[PDB]
Amino acid sequence: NVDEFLFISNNFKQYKEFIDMDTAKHYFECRNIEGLNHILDSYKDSKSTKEKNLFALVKVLLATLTEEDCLTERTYLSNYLINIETWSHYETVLFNNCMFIFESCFIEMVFSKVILNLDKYNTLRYYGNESIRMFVNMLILFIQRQEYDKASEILAKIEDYQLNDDCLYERCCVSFFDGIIGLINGKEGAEQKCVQILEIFQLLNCKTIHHMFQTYLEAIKHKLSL
Amino acid sequence: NVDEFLFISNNFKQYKEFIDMDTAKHYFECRNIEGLNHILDSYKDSKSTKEKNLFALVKVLLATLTEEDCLTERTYLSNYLINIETWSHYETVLFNNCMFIFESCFIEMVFSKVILNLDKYNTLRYYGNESIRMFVNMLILFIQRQEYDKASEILAKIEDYQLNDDCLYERCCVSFFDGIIGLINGKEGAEQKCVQILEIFQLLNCKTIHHMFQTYLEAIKHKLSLE
Amino acid sequence: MWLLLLFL
């Protein structure tokens, strides 16, 4: 807990900057009386690159609301992002919060930059499905042990509480498996339920996962000959 | 930078609690008009164990300032620390900030707990001297290349900007080496200067480090016998 | 090229 504490406290300022942006963005949604206060804070300050960034951000936000277009700041924010050796989260969050201000020519070239440095965001998504990867394995195992009831309970449960998630690959897996359970049971429509999602995997060109979902459906269809 | 952000944000609340304690402690030094407000905030709250801890802390702080003293919180804070499976920083920081309120009977047993779990603070303390370990090596190397001037510049520099540190093992090393430079030069005070700190290493019973500082001083005395 | 290194 100490090392952690130490680590956080050292990087607190950097984190603090993320909070400022967020709150400054919120203010943009509506009221802005304090909108100037950040400026009053960061005008007399107005030192350090990231603190100028914040300043310029609030500037262009305030400006968009009032009857002014401020160019020096809009350009400042622009060149900052254009000139970045290594793209960080901060760079994204900044880029997002001012993308509308930005000229398309920059946006497209900024885009060039951000395309390499998504490596981390991707590997990070995988572990989101580390929950799902597990859920299917249970189902796959429950059917493999012909515990049709158990498997169906899992599904009913995980649709009740994933109800909020609004994630695709989730809703696919649950639907597909809500299929093969009906199919192994033997009611009609379930056989077609499974292919309905299989369309999506083929349509959206997910050859890898399409293969696995397909070959599986065939493989259980095979065994259900008995 | 993302993973970092994620990690911090997750633990932000826990960190936030440390800040509350610190600020609450500051208020205790003097003014408490807002001191009472934190209670007003966390009275109706009183859900999370740590949030009750904060509450109780502010309570006993406020109480000691006022005439009435409320002990139910004093006991609450007490049992919390007594019943701890694994001692964390938070546990220390809390314990510190309310140790005076605590009955000695608890304190002594709490001490038993805390005595095992200092492992982390120790390994952490070593790396404070990773800066100094480096500074000495430089000096040791500069003398080994008989660059007395270079070595003297290093010292003068690192006493100017370590001036603020108020650390012992630092001030030792600089003094000893402020000695050993004078001794190799041939000035009077230095011969005894180096031993003066060597006393401290012997006196405070640091046999390991005493040995190294000693054997070194002998070894250069040796080479300067040739002079 | 003396044969030393580290020490304290």
Short mmCIF file of C-alpha atoms in Angstrom, two decimals, chain B residues 20-198:
data_model
loop_
_atom_site.label_atom_id
_atom_site.label_comp_id
_atom_site.label_asym_id
_atom_site.label_seq_id
_atom_site.Cartn_x
_atom_site.Cartn_y
_atom_site.Cartn_z
CA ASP B 20 -8.69 13.85 3.95
CA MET B 21 -6.76 12.64 6.98
CA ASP B 22 -3.87 15.04 6.18
CA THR B 23 -6.16 18.06 5.74
CA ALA B 24 -8.18 17.08 8.79
CA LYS B 25 -4.93 16.97 10.75
CA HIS B 26 -4.05 20.45 9.47
CA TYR B 27 -7.38 21.84 10.69
CA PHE B 28 -6.57 20.34 14.11
CA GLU B 29 -3.48 22.57 14.35
CA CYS B 30 -5.82 25.59 14.58
CA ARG B 31 -9.12 26.51 12.89
CA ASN B 32 -12.07 24.13 12.80
CA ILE B 33 -15.03 26.05 11.36
CA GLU B 34 -14.85 23.68 8.40
CA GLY B 35 -13.50 21.09 10.86
CA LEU B 36 -17.13 20.61 11.96
CA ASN B 37 -18.36 20.54 8.35
CA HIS B 38 -16.48 17.32 7.53
CA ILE B 39 -18.46 15.69 10.33
CA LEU B 40 -21.70 17.15 8.90
CA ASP B 41 -20.61 15.56 5.59
CA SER B 42 -19.67 12.11 6.95
CA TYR B 43 -22.18 11.82 9.83
CA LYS B 44 -25.20 10.89 7.74
CA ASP B 45 -22.77 9.08 5.44
CA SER B 46 -21.12 6.72 7.96
CA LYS B 47 -21.22 3.73 5.56
CA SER B 48 -17.73 2.65 4.52
CA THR B 49 -15.52 1.42 7.36
CA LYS B 50 -12.79 3.85 6.26
CA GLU B 51 -15.34 6.65 6.07
CA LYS B 52 -16.40 5.91 9.64
CA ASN B 53 -12.68 5.95 10.50
CA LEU B 54 -12.34 9.43 9.02
CA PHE B 55 -15.48 10.49 10.88
CA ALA B 56 -14.23 9.11 14.17
CA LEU B 57 -10.86 10.72 13.59
CA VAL B 58 -12.30 14.18 13.03
CA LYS B 59 -14.57 13.55 16.01
CA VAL B 60 -11.79 12.88 18.48
CA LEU B 61 -9.76 15.74 17.02
CA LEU B 62 -12.63 18.20 17.41
CA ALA B 63 -13.40 16.70 20.83
CA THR B 64 -9.91 17.29 22.23
CA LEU B 65 -10.26 20.93 21.15
CA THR B 66 -13.73 21.33 22.68
CA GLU B 67 -14.61 20.77 26.35
CA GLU B 68 -16.56 17.52 25.89
CA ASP B 69 -14.59 14.38 25.00
CA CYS B 70 -16.40 11.59 23.12
CA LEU B 71 -14.96 8.11 23.76
CA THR B 72 -17.26 5.81 21.75
CA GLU B 73 -15.35 6.96 18.66
CA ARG B 74 -12.09 6.64 20.57
CA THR B 75 -13.02 3.00 21.22
CA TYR B 76 -14.17 2.61 17.62
CA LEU B 77 -10.86 3.77 16.25
CA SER B 78 -9.24 1.50 18.85
CA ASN B 79 -10.85 -1.81 17.95
CA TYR B 80 -10.44 -1.10 14.23
CA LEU B 81 -6.66 -1.07 14.53
CA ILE B 82 -6.58 -3.91 17.01
CA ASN B 83 -8.46 -6.08 14.51
CA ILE B 84 -6.32 -5.86 11.38
CA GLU B 85 -5.27 -8.90 9.33
CA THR B 86 -2.71 -7.02 7.26
CA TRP B 87 -1.17 -3.72 8.25
CA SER B 88 -1.13 -1.10 5.51
CA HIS B 89 0.12 2.47 5.19
CA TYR B 90 -3.40 3.69 5.85
CA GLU B 91 -3.23 1.74 9.11
CA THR B 92 0.01 3.51 10.05
CA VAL B 93 -1.14 6.97 9.03
CA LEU B 94 -4.33 6.46 11.02
CA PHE B 95 -2.53 5.07 13.98
CA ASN B 96 -0.20 8.07 13.97
CA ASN B 97 -2.95 10.62 13.68
CA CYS B 98 -4.86 9.21 16.66
CA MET B 99 -2.12 7.57 18.78
CA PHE B 100 -2.48 10.19 21.53
CA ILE B 101 -6.21 9.39 21.93
CA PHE B 102 -5.38 5.70 22.24
CA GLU B 103 -5.02 3.77 25.49
CA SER B 104 -1.52 2.37 26.05
CA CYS B 105 -2.84 -1.20 26.18
CA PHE B 106 -3.88 -0.96 22.57
CA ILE B 107 -0.80 0.93 21.43
CA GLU B 108 1.43 -1.81 22.80
CA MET B 109 -0.40 -4.57 20.98
CA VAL B 110 -0.74 -2.45 17.85
CA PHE B 111 3.03 -2.11 18.10
CA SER B 112 3.30 -5.89 18.04
CA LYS B 113 1.33 -5.89 14.79
CA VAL B 114 3.28 -3.08 13.16
CA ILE B 115 6.65 -4.57 14.04
CA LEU B 116 6.44 -7.37 11.45
CA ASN B 117 5.00 -5.21 8.66
CA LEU B 118 7.83 -2.64 8.49
CA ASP B 119 9.49 -4.85 5.81
CA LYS B 120 8.29 -2.53 3.04
CA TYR B 121 9.36 0.74 4.70
CA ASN B 122 12.86 -0.70 5.10
CA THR B 123 13.53 -1.90 1.56
CA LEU B 124 12.12 1.45 0.55
CA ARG B 125 14.64 3.28 2.74
CA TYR B 126 17.59 1.60 1.01
CA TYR B 127 16.74 3.25 -2.31
CA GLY B 128 16.95 6.67 -0.69
CA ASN B 129 20.68 6.01 -0.48
CA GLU B 130 20.89 4.83 -4.12
CA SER B 131 21.58 8.50 -4.77
CA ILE B 132 24.28 8.68 -2.12
CA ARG B 133 25.79 5.32 -2.94
CA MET B 134 26.35 6.85 -6.37
CA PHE B 135 27.83 10.11 -4.98
CA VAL B 136 30.43 8.27 -2.90
CA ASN B 137 31.44 6.03 -5.79
CA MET B 138 32.18 9.21 -7.71
CA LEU B 139 34.35 10.50 -4.86
CA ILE B 140 36.01 7.10 -4.32
CA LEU B 141 36.77 7.12 -8.05
CA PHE B 142 37.95 10.69 -8.18
CA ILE B 143 40.43 10.12 -5.37
CA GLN B 144 41.45 6.84 -7.01
CA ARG B 145 42.38 8.90 -10.11
CA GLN B 146 43.95 11.52 -7.83
CA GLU B 147 41.58 14.23 -9.01
CA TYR B 148 41.46 15.94 -5.62
CA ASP B 149 40.03 19.12 -7.19
CA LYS B 150 37.23 17.29 -9.02
CA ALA B 151 36.38 15.42 -5.82
CA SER B 152 36.37 18.66 -3.83
CA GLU B 153 34.01 20.27 -6.37
CA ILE B 154 31.57 17.38 -6.08
CA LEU B 155 31.55 17.79 -2.27
CA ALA B 156 31.10 21.55 -2.24
CA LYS B 157 28.30 21.11 -4.77
CA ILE B 158 26.49 18.28 -2.96
CA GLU B 159 26.64 20.11 0.38
CA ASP B 160 25.11 23.22 -1.17
CA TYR B 161 22.06 21.36 -2.54
CA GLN B 162 21.81 18.60 0.05
CA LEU B 163 21.90 21.50 2.57
CA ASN B 164 18.10 21.09 2.85
CA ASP B 165 18.04 17.29 3.36
CA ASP B 166 18.87 17.01 7.08
CA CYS B 167 19.87 13.33 6.65
CA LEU B 168 22.57 11.69 8.78
CA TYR B 169 24.33 9.11 6.61
CA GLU B 170 24.62 11.86 4.05
CA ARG B 171 26.23 14.39 6.39
CA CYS B 172 28.53 11.61 7.58
CA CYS B 173 29.79 10.72 4.10
CA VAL B 174 30.35 14.35 3.16
CA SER B 175 32.18 15.07 6.44
CA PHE B 176 34.31 11.94 6.26
CA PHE B 177 35.21 12.78 2.68
CA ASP B 178 35.66 16.46 3.53
CA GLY B 179 38.13 14.89 5.95
CA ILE B 180 39.86 12.45 3.60
CA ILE B 181 40.38 15.24 1.04
CA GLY B 182 42.04 17.44 3.70
CA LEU B 183 44.13 14.51 4.92
CA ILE B 184 45.46 13.64 1.47
CA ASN B 185 46.07 17.35 1.01
CA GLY B 186 47.92 17.45 4.35
CA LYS B 187 45.95 19.93 6.46
CA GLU B 188 45.60 19.50 10.23
CA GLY B 189 41.89 19.11 11.17
CA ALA B 190 41.34 16.30 8.66
CA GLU B 191 43.32 13.46 10.29
CA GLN B 192 40.91 13.57 13.24
CA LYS B 193 37.90 14.68 11.17
CA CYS B 194 37.55 11.27 9.53
CA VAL B 195 37.83 9.41 12.82
CA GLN B 196 35.22 11.70 14.41
CA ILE B 197 32.50 10.19 12.20
CA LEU B 198 34.12 6.74 12.53
#
